[PDB]
């Protein structure tokens, strides 16, 4: 039409399934109303009718659309389409609706009572032909069409209407692909990731013909990592699946069990048809065991596999835009030849999901299990450090099983045979997903890792001055580096905290880090005595690629002494303070790019055994002092402790640190804890001697901490420093600071 | 093609080669080009199997063959030249050796001209500073950053805005203009860098460049040069050439500088050897790599080869009592044995450096090996001058600001502290820009022009708050009295 009525269509956010949510500008401009009914019309005659929201962080040009509704339109994601407004509530009187053969089989149950009675229940869903729409519940995902609407060809259905569930199900179209497909939707805890992914294979799989038309190189290579079940092959489908290409799947050992010359065979005709059916997507899934590294080959027919695979890979970028995207566990343990320029230029470290993710990787495969209320899925995803999704997969089917299996099977094992009334009747309790997650799964990894901590600037108490400085020094360099260019200031990147140990030195980092919104690589002691023992100081490489792979980042070594005081303290061995370890920490720093967000931060408690090849310019150079709490800061330590806490109103967090003076950040996290064991230890005792009552069951007495519990938890508190220390502490910085 | 060759059966490739060698000589002149040398005949230890020792013998028996009246001029090219079978480098096979290595700054300049030659660059796009940011890319990183970028600049705009209205047209082509931003963006996350091995380069470092020695100067300018620029009066006189000095002195002084300063002024390569590299090959046993570098200088000659620190091995096992043994070294001995095998004249000339001369092994001091003993010395005023001058001479500083006065009043001060004062007093000026920014952002009643960014006075009177002295005077007086004894005892 060439005047503005036209969107584009991106992913959506809301859990609805039948609506579509607009920028609170592109409602008034478009002349319409916040939930009014449009008409959502596009590729090949096909339209729909929805309702509208608004939502402030999808952009003007920009339209929300769950996965359902835009596969109903034809379109794929990534298209345009045109919204007309459509007042006209043709309000409906009867449905004839069917499901498919393909979803619905095995299921024994009255589908209109299982399904469709709370999902048509006081809803005012517009409906027209052609819509094949979905309802979850029962551990099922049900796929209706609707063949015949009382009014035609559309309708909106009133609570009073009537829903007519007659007839068989019917067999699947040619023209609408499945909704047991995977999309982007299911994937949780990779929404970073997936935005390389999708921005790298936009254009050369729904835009074709653009790059026939313009002389510029195609990513062709793609190879995606991390461990085992994170979610690499489920990425791939979903990309294929979206941008609507054709998908081959190669699976490593497959192609490897066959007989010798029959291998390469296949792997020759895999690409040929994969050729013949461009756009295209190739998925050489387990590729450490089809092109292991040099060292582990051993035999001619090994090797010339990894030739012919080679081969290919050079072979198919003359014309041909084909992607092949490949999937490894570890990506120093495929053969390096692979990795050469032309064949797998681009690298994708998917890597474990966190909080966050696990969060949305339990909502994804809770979707149709029909929990029960007391279920906070809150706690649980902050009881999975360590799992991948698979392990989540896998803990959810664990659980569901665990409610079939107390009762409703068992139960109903005599009476009565299987039916659909019991699948809707099972909720999951809480308990269930503890006994789950309690023992019967053995969380499958153990890495570093990777993640954006928690820790927020409130969760310190003091250190107002190193708040400052910590933020000019990680953030001015990115938020204005024409201020450094202009004038030519080079950013230094490096930082070492030093002073008592116990005081936030980690916590400064999880909190700049966190402010900033980088990645965090926490790199412990025993971590380096372990690299120093086993003589294996070429591991210290490996953790600076992390923190290239996961830019921007913050690595954070502490306890860098260690090395240092492990071969004896001030005398202790007689060689100087260079080490197998630290030595490795200087090279690969000095050797890092110009600036790619990386920013080292050390820590140590004695700052005297340090090797001083560190503290030159180039590497860590800005010492910074984390000195012993003061009143005004202890009352803070203390709240910020306390907070998580239910605590009396009557006790005093001034007088405590008012009585402990010299006190380290974590004595007075030590008396906390304590406090907190005394009132555990009454509660438990008072429920045991209420359960001795035998002569009538009541509500547990009031649990706020109370004071005098802090009167006893502070007559076994230790002072975790010497004078001494801080003396030693003063006398570095007077030295170093004032001597000359 | 190397694993194209290596793909067909037994039998297949060498049949191959054989019909391939054929063809060239039936089309002569010719060029044999053998991609991915060391994936067809690696080393014998690499090597297992007959299949793969015959096609090797099949390449050496082809190599050995062709040259009888057939002008075919065979150019193989491998990763690393010590990876393939040593019995292709022997005479008549494999005899000339080039090595292409990295770019450099002019060079990843002019890659980049060659790469956008028809992309349309904005006017803002300043290559410069694109090519001075791209230390680590080779050839294919520019030309993938060029295409990325350029894919970057057609995927924000001007395809999908174009999407509903109209389809695809040269117009939108021309009218593409990729801007610096963009530019920045596919350099800035987007492309992981491939390689960060030892550098070669003449580095851009010039006389003016560092404050005052003006004697060490010509004496540098002496030694690199006249045995060049003049062999005769060498050859007449019958004097040799010495082929080392030895700087040392406090550290941080300009040893560095006057390596990369002389290196430049003969438009000679430059191969830093930093401390952690000795250490390294110290700590891993591995001090068999110590070969390879000189074979870098010869590669890349003319050179001059810098060994800073060279006391770090020294020291590490402890320092003037330190461990039992003596000054022998597993490292320091390898570059003695080199040093003293390497040819009579292929004009690389070995620069050491050390902060610590008492603890270095003194059986480098001796003639034929580093000899000339150069003693950087702490600066003056007349050198501070120049030294503060020449460090901020790139940042705009203000002109009520005296830096003679700086100079009279940091005394002793090592040339390297004269250099955080320069970049302290930078960070005061640069948050006192932000902090007004943000002020000025402030503004919500009415945008304007930033204050004027001259480094102002009163920003070094609290840069010099901060000030340190970097080498105590017990230091100077240690490098005082090795200059006495060993120059003027007896
Ligand atoms: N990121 C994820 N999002 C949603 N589900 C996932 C994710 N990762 C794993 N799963 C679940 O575990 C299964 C394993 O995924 P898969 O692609 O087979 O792992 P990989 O290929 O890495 O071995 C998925 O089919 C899904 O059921
Ligand atoms: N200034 C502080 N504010 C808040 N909590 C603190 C502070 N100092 C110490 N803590 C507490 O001490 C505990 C350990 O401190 P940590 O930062 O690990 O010590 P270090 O700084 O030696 O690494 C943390 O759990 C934290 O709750
Ligand atoms: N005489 C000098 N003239 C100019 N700059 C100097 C001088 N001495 C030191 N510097 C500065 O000190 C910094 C480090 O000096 P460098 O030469 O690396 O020390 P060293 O001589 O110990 O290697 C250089 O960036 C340089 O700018």
Partial sequence: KNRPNRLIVDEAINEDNSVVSLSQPKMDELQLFRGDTVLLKGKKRREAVCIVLSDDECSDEKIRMNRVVRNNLRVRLGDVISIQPCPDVKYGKRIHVLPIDDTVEGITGNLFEVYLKPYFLEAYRPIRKGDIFLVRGGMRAVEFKVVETDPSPYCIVAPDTVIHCEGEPIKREDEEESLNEVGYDDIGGCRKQLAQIKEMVELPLRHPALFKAIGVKPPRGILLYGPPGTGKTLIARAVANETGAFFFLI????????????????????????????????????????????????????????????????????????????????????????????????????????????????????????????????????????????????????????????????????????????????????????????????????????????????????????????????????????????????????????????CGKTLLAKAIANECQANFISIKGPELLTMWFGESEANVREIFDKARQAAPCVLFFDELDSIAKARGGNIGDGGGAADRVINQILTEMDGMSTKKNVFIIGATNRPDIIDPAILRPGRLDQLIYIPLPDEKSRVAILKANLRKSPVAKDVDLEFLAKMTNGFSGADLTEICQRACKLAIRESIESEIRRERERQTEEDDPVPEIRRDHFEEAMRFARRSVSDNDIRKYEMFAQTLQQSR
């Fill in 251 to 502: 699976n490593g050992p497959e192609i490897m069990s066959k007989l010798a010359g029959e291998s390469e065979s296949n792997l020759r005709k895999a690409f040929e048809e994969a050729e013949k059916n461009a756009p295209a997507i190739i998925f050489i899934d387990e590729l450490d065991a089809i092109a292991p590294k040099r060292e582990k080959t051993h035999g001619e027919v090994e090797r010339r596999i990894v030739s012919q695979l080679l081969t290919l890979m050079d072979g198919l970028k003359q014309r041909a835009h084909v992607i092949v995207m490949a999937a490894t566990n570890r990506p120093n343990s495929i053969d390096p030849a692979l990795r050469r320029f032309g064949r797998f230029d681009r690298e994708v470290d998917i890597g474990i999901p966190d909080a966050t993710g696990r969060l949305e990787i339990l909502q994804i495969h809770t979707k149709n299990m029909k929990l029960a209320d007391d279920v906070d899925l809150e706690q649980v995803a902050n009881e999975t450090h360590g799992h991948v999704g698979a392990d989540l997969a896998a803990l959810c089917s664990e659980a569901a099983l665990q409610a079939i299996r107390k009762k409703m099977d068992l139960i109903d094992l005599e009476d009565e045979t299987i039916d659909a009334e019991v699948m809707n009747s099972l909720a999951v309790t809480m308990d269930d997903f503890r006994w789950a997650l309690s023992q019967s799964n053995p969380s499958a990894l153990r890495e570093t890792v990777v993640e954006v901590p928690q820790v927020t600037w409130e969760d310190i108490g003091g250190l107002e001055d190193v708040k400052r400085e910590l933020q000019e020094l990680v953030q001015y360099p990115v938020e204005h580096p024409d201020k450094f260019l202009k004038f030519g200031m080079t950013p230094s990147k490096g930082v070492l905290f030093y002073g008592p140990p116990g």
